[PDB]
Design a protein around this ligand. Structure first.
Ligand SMILES: Nc1nc2c(ncn2[C@H]2C[C@H](O)[C@@H](COP(=O)(O)OP(=O)(O)OP(=O)(O)O)O2)c(=O)[nH]1
Ligand SMILES: [Mn+2]
Ligand SMILES: [Mn+2]
Length: 333
């Protein structure tokens, strides 16, 4: 038996069922593009199960008694096992709707609602968007300007170089302030679509006004192509950036999220920002459904008692929810 929730089972970075999970995730994504949130979560859960399996699925009899594997997800695997291809997945891959929604939603600053609006308005290509700049936010304009670089996977070596410049800027602005790599790279991934950093200081409140100082420094070194600062509204102070990463003989644009959290909230922010998206969705559903507690990136609240949990680490949070600790590299759900 394998547990129902992704937060109750280790999901490693690499697994034995990449072809099958990829097919299911194409169906998940396409459902999300159509606003079919239910079907999205269903395919995503089924994909996540395959990722946690210790062996490859070579016959359909191996699906027996697995959670989150309904009729539709089973048929997909079946056709792939029996014919090497699933017709519905290939139709989706070649569909103009899917290809366009993928193209648009991949652009920095574009979500599903925007992509779908643009689709319904007859926009199809990147050039179509560039011909209608009045329809674009400044963030989306920057996304388009750098789209080739921003669709090139970010590598671990890029992350290392970026963490150095961010640590130097942070260290110069405020001694004692820390930078923590989060997101997919903290989960052990070898590549990504951006780099995520969480910034704090051990004395609560010393992190006030730090991010703008970090950004000034980075800007002065020629490292920033685009920067949008947002103050917290509640909800963390953050900066959405495109860095200009020097490389031997050239350079590349890379997406970076810099998030500041007060150290009291840091374990929650780290947990939330480390992901995966599905893992965190599942952890929050678990906390609510199973334990009656509301988890987010700022805290763990008991709505009956009107209390907040005091957490020193991620381990404290897992412990409090009755879950065995999962290090970041087993959260790849
Ligand atoms: N607190 C908070 N967490 C978020 C938000 N958006 C996404 N997350 C979570 C879920 C993700 O696993 C994680 C970082 O987002 P990313 O889109 O960078 O995902 P991740 O780094 O896992 O994958 P990647 O390798 O960048 O494609 O943070 C947000 O607005 N607020
Ligand atoms: Mn990321
Ligand atoms: Mn990010």
């Amino acid at each position: 038996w394998m547990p129902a929730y992704a937060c109750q089972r280790p999901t490693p970075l690499t697994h034995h069922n990449t072809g099958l999970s990829e097919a299911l995730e194409i169906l998940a994504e396409a459902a999300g593009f159509e606003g079919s949130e239910g079907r999205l979560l269903t395919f995503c859960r089924a994909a996540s199960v395959l990722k946690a399996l210790p062996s490859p699925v070579t016959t359909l009899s191996q699906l027996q008694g697995l959670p989150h594997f309904g009729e539709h997800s089973s048929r997909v695997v079946q056709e792939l096992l029996e014919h090497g291809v699933c017709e519905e997945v290939e139709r989706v891959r070649r569909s103009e709707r899917y290809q366009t929604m993928k193209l648009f939603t991949q652009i920095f600053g574009v979500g599903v609602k925007t992509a779908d609006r643009w689709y319904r308005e007859g926009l199809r290509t990147l050039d179509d968007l560039r011909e209608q700049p009045q329809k674009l936010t400044q963030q989306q304009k920057a996304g388009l300007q750098h789209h080739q670089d921003l669709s090139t996977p970010v590598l671990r070596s890029d992350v290392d170089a970026l963490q150095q410049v961010v640590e130097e800027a942070v260290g110069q602005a405020l001694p004692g302030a820390t930078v923590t790599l989060t997101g997919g790279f903290r989960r052990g991934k070898l590549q990504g679509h951006d780099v995520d950093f969480l910034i704090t200081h051990p004395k609560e409140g010393q992190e006030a006004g730090l991010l703008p100082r970090v950004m000034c420094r980075l800007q002065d070194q020629g490292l920033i192509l685009y920067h949008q600062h947002q103050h917290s509204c509640c909800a963390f102070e953050r900066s959405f950036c495109i860095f200009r990463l020097p490389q031997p003989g050239s350079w590349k644009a890379v997406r970076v999220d810099l998030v500041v959290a007060p150290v009291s909230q840091f374990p929650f922010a780290l947990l939330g920002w480390t992901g995966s998206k599905l893992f965190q969705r599942e952890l929050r559903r678990f906390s609510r459904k199973e334990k009656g507690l509301w988890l987010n990136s700022h805290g763990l609240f008991d709505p009956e008692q009107k209390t907040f949990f005091q957490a020193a680490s991620e381990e404290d949070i897992f412990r409090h929810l009755g879950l065995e600790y999962l290090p970041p590299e087993q959260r790849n759900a």
